[PDB]
Amino acid sequence: GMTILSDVKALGQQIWLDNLSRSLVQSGELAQMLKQGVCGVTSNPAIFQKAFAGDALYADEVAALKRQNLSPKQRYETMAVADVRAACDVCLAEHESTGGKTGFVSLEVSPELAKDAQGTVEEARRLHAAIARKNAMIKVPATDAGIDALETLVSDGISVNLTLLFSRAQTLKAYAAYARGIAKRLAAGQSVAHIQVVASFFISRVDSALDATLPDRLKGKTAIALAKAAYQDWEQYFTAPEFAALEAQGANRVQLLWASTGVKNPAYPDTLYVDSLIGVHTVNTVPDATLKAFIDHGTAKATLTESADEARARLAEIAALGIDVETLAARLQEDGLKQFEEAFEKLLAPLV
Numbered sequence: 001g002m003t004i005l006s007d008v009k010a011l012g013q014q015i016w017l018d019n020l021s022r023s024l025v026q027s028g029e030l031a032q033m034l035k036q037g038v039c040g041v042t043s044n045p046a047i048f049q050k051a052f053a054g055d056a057l058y059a060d061e062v063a064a065l066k067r068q069n070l071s072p073k074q075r076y077e078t079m080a081v082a083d084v085r086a087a088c089d090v091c092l093a094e095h096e097s098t099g100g101k102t103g104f105v106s107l108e109v110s111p112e113l114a115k116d117a118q119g120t121v122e123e124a125r126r127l128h129a130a131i132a133r134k135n136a137m138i139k140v141p142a143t144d145a146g147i148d149a150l151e152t153l154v155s156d157g158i159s160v161n162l163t164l165l166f167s168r169a170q171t172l173k174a175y176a177a178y179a180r181g182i183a184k185r186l187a188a189g190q191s192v193a194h195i196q197v198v199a200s201f202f203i204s205r206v207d208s209a210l211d212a213t214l215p216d217r218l219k220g221k222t223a224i225a226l227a228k229a230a231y232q233d234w235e236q237y238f239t240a241p242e243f244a245a246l247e248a249q250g251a252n253r254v255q256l257l258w259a260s261t262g263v264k265n266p267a268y269p270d271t272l273y274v275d276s277l278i279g280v281h282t283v284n285t286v287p288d289a290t291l292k293a294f295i296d297h298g299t300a301k302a303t304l305t306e307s308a309d310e311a312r313a314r315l316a317e318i319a320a321l322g323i324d325v326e327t328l329a330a331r332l333q334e335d336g337l338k339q340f341e342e343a344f345e346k347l348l349a350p351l352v
Contacts, residue, residue, distance in 0.1 A: 020048075046343040049346050088131065100193075108138075114143050124140060164200070188248065277303065
C-alpha cells in the first residue's frame with residue numbers, strides 16, 4: 001500500500017517520479033504525490049517528447065509560442081522551463097523542510113552539448129537562472145566533458161544530476177570532480193551546504209543489452225550486481241578521510257540515484273529493480289507504472305547491501321565470459337545520447 005513510500009524513506013531512500021508534464025502539475029496531482037511520499041521529479045528529452053505529444057494542455061501554449069519569433073529550441077525551452085518551475089514550486093515545501101536535501105526537479109541540457117564542456121556549462125548556468133528555483137537540478141550526461149562541466153558547475157554553487165552513468169569507473173571520476181569543485185568553494189570561503197549532486201546510474205539498460213546471450217544463472221542479475229558494487233564504491237569513497245574533511249565543513253555527499261528502473265523484460269517481476277536496490281542515502285526515480293506496481297506489491301527492505309559477495313562473484317563471471325562492463329558502459333552511454341537526441345528532434349519538429 002501507499003505507506004510503502006514512507007517505509008522506504010525510513011530505510012534512507014527517496015523515491016522520485018520519472019515523469020513530468022503540464023497536467024501532472026496543473027491538476028494538483030504532483031502536489032498530492034509530494035504529500036504521499038514522492039520526493040522529487042526527473043525529466044529527460046524522451047519524457048518531454050511524450051508529454052508534449054500527449055498532454056492536451058500544451059496545445060494552447062504551442063499556439064501562443066508559434067505567434068512569436070522563436071526557434072523550435074526556444075519554444076521547447078519555454079515550455080519545459082515553465083513545467084519545471086511549476087513543479088519546483090510544488091516541491092518547495094518538501095525541499096525546505098529537509099534543509100534542501102529533497103524535493104528536487106531535474107531538467108536536462110541539450111544532448112548536442114554532451115561532448116562540449118564549455119557549452120554545457122553555459123547552458124546549465126542559463127537554465128539554472130531561467131528556472132530560478134533553489135530546488136532545480138540541471139541534468140548533465142556523464143561523458144568526460146560532462147565531468148569537466150560538473151566540477152565547474154559545483155564550484156559555481158549549482159546542483160547537478162549527472163546522468164547516463166553505467167560505469168563504476170566513470171562514477172568515481174564524477175565523485176572526484178565533485179570534490180574538487182567543493183574544495184574550490186571552501187578555499188574561497190563560499191557556502192557548500194546547499195549544493196546537492198546525484199549520480200544517476202542506469203539499471204534496466206544493462207540487462208537489456210546482455211541477457212539474451214548470458215548463461216541461465218546470470219540472466220537478470222548483472223545490472224543489480226553492478227549497482228550493488230557501485231554502492232560499495234560509494235561507501236568507501238565518501239567515508240574516506242579526504243571526503244570526511246570536506247563533509248566536516250558542510251559538504252554534502254553525492255548520492256547514487258537508480259534510473260531506468262522500470263522493468264523491460266516480462267520475465268522479471270515489475271518491482272525487481274526497486275525492491276532490490278533500497279539502501280541508505282540513495283534515490284530511485286521510477287516511471288508511473290513502476291511506482292504503481294511498487295505501491296501495490298513492492299517490498300520495503302534494505303536490499304541494496306545484501307549479498308555483496310554474490311554481486312562480486314557475478315561480476316567476476318561476467319568478466320570471465322568476456323563481457324567488459326566498461327566497454328559496455330561506454331556503448332550504452334553513446335546509445336542513450338543518440339536516443340535522447342532522436343527524441344529531442346522528434347519533439348522539435350512540431351514546434352517549427
